[PDB]
Each structure stands twice: as C-alpha cells, then as structure tokens.
Structure 1
Amino acid sequence: RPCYLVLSSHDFRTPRRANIHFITDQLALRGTTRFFSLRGDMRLPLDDTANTVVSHNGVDCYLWRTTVHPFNTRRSWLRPVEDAMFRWYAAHPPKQLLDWMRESDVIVFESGIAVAFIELAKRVNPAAKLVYRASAGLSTINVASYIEREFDRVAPTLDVIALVSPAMAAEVVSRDNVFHVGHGVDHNLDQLGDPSPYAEGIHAVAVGSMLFDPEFFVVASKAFPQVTFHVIGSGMGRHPGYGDNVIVYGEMKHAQTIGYIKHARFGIAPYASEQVPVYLADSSMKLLQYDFFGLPAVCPNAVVGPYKSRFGYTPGNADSVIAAITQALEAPRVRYRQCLNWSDTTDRVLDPRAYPETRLYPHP
C-alpha cells in the first residue's frame, strides 16, 4: 500500500472540493494519504489547527502556517526580494513536511507554490515518484518569476507531469515526462443525477463561483422569462438585476448539484472575463459536469474550445448572450465527451506511462 503526499495551496478540509481533492479521495482509498497545505484566505476557519496534523476523511491534513509566505509582488524591481522570499520558504520546510516526504511512495505537487518543494522532495526521498498535477498553467496563476524558473529547472526530473489539458504543454519545458490526464468525474454521476429537483418548464443551471458574472443572468432572465435560471454556488446573493425567474441557491454539496445539472435543459459557465487560458475549455470542472450529461452549455467564446454543444457569447454583450442561449435551447443532448471517473483518472495521474494514450510527445 503506497503512501501519498499531496502538496498544494488548497487544504483538503476546505468545503467545495477542487480537482486535487477528488484525486486525493482516490489516493486515500489506495494508501496512507497526506495532504500538506502551502502558502483573506479560504483556509482561515482552519487557523486554530495550523501546524498540526488533523485527520479528515481518511487523509492526514496539515495546514502549514508561517508568518509570511512568498508571493508575486508583480513589481519587476522587487524580484530579488521575491526570489529571496521563495528561497527562504523553500529552505525552511517544517519537520512534518520532511517526515511526510520521507514516508511517501508518491508525492503529488499541484501546480503553483508546490513547485518550490520539488527539489526538496528529491533530496528527502529520491525513490519517491514525483507527480506534478498541472491543474493550472503557472502563468495563469501568475506565480512569481521564481516559481516559473524553478519549474523549468526541475520539470525534466519529475517522474510525471500530468497536464489537465494538452494546451498546457507549450509552457512546460520538458517532454519525455509530460502526459495528458484531464479531470475525472464521479463514478456515480448518473446515480446522483436524480430524482429531479425541477417541476415542469425550462430550467437552466449554473454552478460555481469562478469569475461569476451576474450580468449574464440579469440579461438572460429578462430575455427568457420562460426559462428558470438556477444559480448555484455563485459566491454571490440575489443580484438586484435578476428577474423573478432566477433562483439563487447557497453553496450546494457536489452530490446535490448533480440533479440540477442532469435535469436542466442547458447549463451555463458565466465567466465574466475572456482573459482566460486556452486550456480552461478542458480544465473547467463545471463544463465537464455538463459535458458528462451532454447538457448543452452557454459559456464565453474563450472557453467553448474544441467542444460541441457549447454556445459562445461575449461577456457584457447582451445580444451574444441571447443568441447563445437561443441555440443552447435547441441543441440536442449528446454525450460527446469521454469522461473517465476519478479512480481511472487517478490511475493515469500516477502511472501515465501504463496508459500510453496520455503521452504528449513521441512514445518509448
């Protein structure tokens, strides 16, 4: 039974799992799983647990809290101070990190600050398989110059670079160890799918707070008084612009969202900006959920990507909003996207070479 360590800026305990949490759920099923949280913070409710191991759903969690963390100042002239701060951070891992590294068979570094600990991992445990999970491009996160360089530096020495999107590969300075392993879905999405939460009529759903654009709903609700818009986990309340045909929900647990997704007529990824990476079309978790069911989606043009059943609009552009919805209403529901479950996904994250279709560069 292999022992796993996940390094990330998430904490495993934060409600509303991201991709890394779902992977970590799978790791916990396979072996001793540790999850070692790095870097107003979402993790503040956990502050009284800082610097101690807490067990959560079978995972050993640690929220490392230093006085200051290294970060991108976004000031070219402050760059030697940054590098100094990152080097310092990197040079003072807590004993607990070091111990967990020693104990691991596999260390997973999520894209971001975790990069600063790859060299450390190799010194502490050269036998550990080093898996980098590129949940995001470094440039999108806008990491400090130090993290980019360090990543370019260490990237070839990683055992696995598991990119959520092949579109991530251009900015990854390595080849032989770069694989494509997109997000999984819950193995029982279709079982969670229902009973239906909706009565008669036309229902559209949006889930998640990422770049949440209320203006989408302001326009859409007015233009489609016959569509009921279910806005879940927007991170926001009832925008005063919403028509009465918008229902605003608090944060819902993933499982409870599923019925609202399966039984909608179309879904919506209402990102307020198109200043988004090209890979977001692949890496969007909500879009994936919609895609699993063949639910037509309305989303900005920037995240349609290479996908059928996605109707682009320009945020801020009422007409394009209307036009995309008009098409999403008439789109047939077809499961175009192949969606591996989280377990099958975690299998390729960990051993992509055993699944040679994941290779992004010429095979051995």
Structure 2
Amino acid sequence: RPCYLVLSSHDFRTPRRANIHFITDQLALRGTTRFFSLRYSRLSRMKGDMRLPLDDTANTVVSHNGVDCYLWRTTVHPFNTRRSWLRPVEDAMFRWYAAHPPKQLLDWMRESDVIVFESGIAVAFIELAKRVNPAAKLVYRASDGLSTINVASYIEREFDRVAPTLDVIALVSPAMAAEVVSRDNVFHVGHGVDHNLDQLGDPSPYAEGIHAVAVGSMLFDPEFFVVASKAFPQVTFHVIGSGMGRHPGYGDNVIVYGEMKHAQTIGYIKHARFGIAPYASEQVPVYLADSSMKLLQYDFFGLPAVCPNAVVGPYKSRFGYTPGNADSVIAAITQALEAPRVRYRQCLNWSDTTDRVLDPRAYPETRLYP
C-alpha cells in the first residue's frame, strides 16, 4: 500500500517525539504503518522507562495517529550489563530475545513491504525480518552510532554481521559511517524538519528584549544557565522541556517551561536572538553536531547557537564553549549575540527526508561510497 513496519526502542505513542516519530508520520501518510516497540520488559520498571504509562496496553495493537502500535513487553529484555564477564549471558539473553519474537511481530513483518530498523535493539531482528519476508525492503535508520548508545557487544556484532544485507543503511550523519561495516548500502540522510517550520514560528512568544532559547532535555546542563543567566542579566533564557525544573542557580532572567508540543516550540526558536544546546558533556560522538535535533531546528532559522565545542562540528553560527567553564560560556554567548542570522544549513522537510530514507539510491547525493 506500501506497508511499513518500524522497529524501535521508542514507542510511537510517547509524547516526547524523536526523529523516528517524524519519519513514522510520513510513513503513515504513504501506507499502513506499524510501529513495534522493543526493549521493554517487566525489568523496565526497575530503571524508569518513559513507556510505562503504556504498560496496560503492552502486547496488544493500539492505533495512534494512523499508526498501529505495539509495545512488546517481555519479562526481561536483553541489555548491556557493562561487565565483560557477563557477556556470555548477554549474548544468551539477546539470542533468546531475538529467538522469541511475538507472533504479532512476525505477522507485521510478513505484511510489510518496508521494515525500518532504528539503530539499537532493532538490530537483533534484522535477520528475522529477512527470514520472514525476504521481499521486504530493510531499512536501517541510524539515529545513533551503536557504540555511542553503548549497545551490548551482541548488538554491535550482529549489526556488523547483518549490515551488508540491509537494503538501506540511512545514516543521520556521514560521521557514523566509520563504525558501519558495509559500504554499498550506506547513505547519508540527515534529520528532516517539518515542511511547516516557518509557518509554525509565527507569531512571536516574546515581548521586547533579548531572548535565548534552549529546547530539549538531552544531556541538559543547568549549569550553563546558572552561569549564562548571571553573566547576561539583559538576556531572557527560555528553557523549554529541559527535563528538569527551575534550578536554584538560575537567575530571574531564566524562564523554565515544561514539556512543550513541538509545534509550539517553534516560535520560541524562530524569534530568539540565539539558541542553546546545553549538552553537559563533550563525551559525545562527532556526529551529534549533525544529529542534534535542537541544533538542526536553530539552523533551519539560521539562529546562532551556543553549544559545547564538541558539537559545533562542521557548522557556522555555532559558538562553542566548554561545559563547566564559565568564561567559555560567556565568550560563546557574547559571540552568538553578535552573530548574524543566516540560513547556512539546507534542511529537507520530513517527507523529502523520508523519501531519501526509503529510496536513497533514487537520490544519488545521499551515497556515502562510490
């Protein structure tokens, strides 16, 4: 119809939408779309899974925004124990998990024309997909490098083993290609933006003054704002969906917002003087410069950005600092305040991105290899 199946450790029903959600929306426009949510177990209650609100729907198909969703809940799920001595039990758990898919996965695999595997646990199901439906186009979407999200050795090995057999390896960033053991099926397809951004970004949420925006909780560093708010009393810092509340070190020029619907964030981005990607750590992959969603959204608007030096990457209008280093935070902001707004980055919309995720060979510029 084309029929799509997405395998991911996300669930489609989560309010926090990631890249795979935006792709899945596009898929849902193109045909019947299923989103099979992995790495969820009774153990998932021990540490604190964001999909727990969905638990009473586990192991059943739920429709959500035109997508058939299934949160697979096993008793235990396989994971990186991060103990090299536990690797043989890890491998056993992974093999077991992969050997016991629910019939619902098998049926959906069979019904699909296209199966999209997100980087991560979905790797464990690539071989299975090929056995169930060798006609399905198998599309790996590398939202992350495997080693960065620190998958179990099993997943890395399995990915290396099956990578050549994928129809598509769609890397968010060319920087991910070094750890992908395949070539001819490896493509660059960065994150999309909504087709709509410029419309969403009006009207302005801001009154007079200088407004800085940060959106998102990834590695959120409150210390950035502690320093920045003190150093720039004339700047209002709009801290949206940081995943935490009003840190006691924030000055009064910091406005802390709860989670905001993506569409509503856009005005705050479009009309800001500069944006901030306050990653607490520089222990981040080189690709984060490319794969950062907030930074892409700032870039869409040409919004000058302040971010750690490690995610400035190959980009203009990004002013790097060292986390924990007040002077560098201050120096970066001073620069971002004076930076012109220029749309340097070409940002395909989600539909055009999905086109390329699905059929990168039709868009030969996506090729990462001869």
SS at match of 2:148: helix
SS at match of 2:354: helix
Q: What CA distance in whole angstroms lies between the structure 1 residues aligned with 2:317 and 2:48?
A: 37
Q: What CA distance in whole angstroms lies between the structure 1 residues aligned with 2:201 and 2:80?
A: 41
Equivalent residue runs for 1:87-102 within 5 Å: 87-102=95-110
Q: Give the drift of 1:69.
A: 0.2
Greater than 4 Å deviation, 4+ residue runs: none
Q: Give the drift of 1:13.
A: 0.1
Q: What CA distance in whole angstroms lies between the structure 1 residues aligned with 2:157 and 2:257?
A: 42
Equivalent residue runs for 1:259-274 within 5 Å: 259-274=267-282
Q: What CA distance in whole angstroms lies between the structure 1 residues aligned with 2:206 and 2:87?
A: 53
Once the two structures are superposed, residues 110-165 of structure 1 have per-residue CA deviations (whole angstroms, 9 ceiling, x without a partner) of 00000000000000000000000000000001000000000000000000000000
Moved more, 220-229 or 34-43: 34-43
Once the two structures are superposed, residues 24-53 of structure 1 have per-residue CA deviations (whole angstroms, 9 ceiling, x without a partner) of 000000000000000910000000000000
Say whether residues 1:282 and 2:290 are aligned partners.
Answer: yes
SS at match of 1:63: strand
SS at match of 1:64: strand
Q: Give the drift of 1:16.
A: 1.7
Q: What CA distance in whole angstroms lies between the structure 2 residues aligned with 1:139 and 1:60?
A: 30
Once the two structures are superposed, residues 253-287 of structure 1 have per-residue CA deviations (whole angstroms, 9 ceiling, x without a partner) of 00000000000000000000000000000000000
Q: What CA distance in whole angstroms lies between the structure 1 residues aligned with 2:342 and 2:124?
A: 42
Unaligned 5+ runs, structure 1: none
Once the two structures are superposed, residues 189-244 of structure 1 have per-residue CA deviations (whole angstroms, 9 ceiling, x without a partner) of 00001110000010000000000000000000000000000000000100000000
Q: Give the drift of 1:310.
A: 0.1
SS at match of 1:247: strand
Once the two structures are superposed, residues 299-338 of structure 1 have per-residue CA deviations (whole angstroms, 9 ceiling, x without a partner) of 0000000000000000000000000000000000000000
Unaligned 5+ runs, structure 2: 39-46
Q: What CA distance in whole angstroms lies between the structure 1 residues aligned with 2:366 and 2:22?
A: 20
Q: What CA distance in whole angstroms lies between the structure 2 residues aligned with 1:214 and 1:289?
A: 21
**What is the RMSD computed on CA atoms of the aligned residues?**
0.8
SS at match of 1:139: coil
Equivalent residue runs for 1:113-192 within 5 Å: 113-192=121-200
Q: What CA distance in whole angstroms lies between the structure 1 residues aligned with 2:258 and 2:142?
A: 29
Q: What CA distance in whole angstroms lies between the structure 2 residues aligned with 1:281 and 1:357?
A: 20
TM-score (normalizing by structure 1): 0.99
Counterpart in 1 of 2:42? none
TM-score (normalizing by structure 2): 0.97
Counterpart in 1 of 2:25? 25
Q: What CA distance in whole angstroms lies between the structure 2 residues aligned with 1:216 and 1:28?
A: 39
SS at match of 1:54: strand
Q: What CA distance in whole angstroms lies between the structure 1 residues aligned with 2:16 and 2:342?
A: 28
SS at match of 1:194: coil
